[PDB]
Write a protein that binds this ligand. Structure first.
Ligand SMILES: COc1cc(COc2cncnc2)nc(N2CCNCC2)n1
Lengths: 39, 156
């Protein structure tokens, strides 16, 4: 049996930690909802 | 139960200890998460029970108590925040510029941020604070790093 606990409000936080790159990827999506790399 | 808008951990006791299998978003009294997190299973909130209302394994989405409510979209330009909610750790905003998933059916936003699996269902935000989709379905790239789609459902 799964259960939920509240973890915070949904808000934009000014001066949040800004990281991560921005890559363009070619992908397929199967019937099972699993994405895969099309190279 | 607690039906307050905001972001929630999804926990099980079926393993060792309490374990965070994923994350979700309560809005308009509907709970939104990813299908692989709950597998369609019912949820408990205090003594409250949440029953699944809509899901699609292919979109990897599921709503509880009502139809999918979150209709906001990435505009294609602006940065966004992953409101990440990792196992055993405090909700943390991470601002990022999404990349792109190019598919035979069209282009979706992608977010390159690597967090434990139990973070699946953490929401992604536009600057006005609206949820434009959920982090936690996507792909592992050359490097070994993980890239997630911005997965959004359709509102009726
Ligand atoms: C596409 O996003 C993910 C990530 C993960 C967990 O892998 C991670 C590895 N390293 C860091 N963080 C996470 N599982 C799933 N799924 C969903 C669909 N199959 C069932 C598990 N999706």
């Amino acid at each position: 049996d799964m259960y939920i606990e509240r973890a915070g409000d949904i808000t934009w936080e000014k001066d949040a930690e800004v990281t991560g790159n921005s890559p363009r990827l070619d992908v397929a999506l199967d019937e099972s909802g699993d994405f895969s790399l099309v190279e | 139960g607690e039906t307050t808008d905001g972001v929630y951990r999804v926990m099980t006791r079926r393993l060792l200890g309490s374990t965070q299998v994923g994350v979700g978003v309560m809005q308009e009294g509907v709970f939104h998460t990813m299908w692989h997190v709950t597998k369609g299973a019912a949820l408990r909130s205090g003594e409250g029970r949440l029953d699944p209302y809509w899901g699609d394994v292919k979109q990897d989405l599921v709503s509880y108590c009502g139809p999918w409510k979150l209709d906001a979209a990435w505009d294609g330009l602006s940065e966004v925040q992953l409101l990440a909610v990792p196992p055993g750790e405090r909700a943390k905003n991470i601002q990022t510029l999404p990349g792109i998933f190019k598919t035979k059916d069209g282009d979706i936003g992608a977010v390159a941020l690597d967090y434990p699996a139990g973070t699946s269902g953490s929401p992604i935000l536009d600057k006005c604070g609206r949820v434009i989709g959920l982090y936690g379905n996507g792909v592992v790239i050359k490097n070994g790093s993980y890239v997630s789609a911005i997965t959004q459902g359709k509102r009726e």
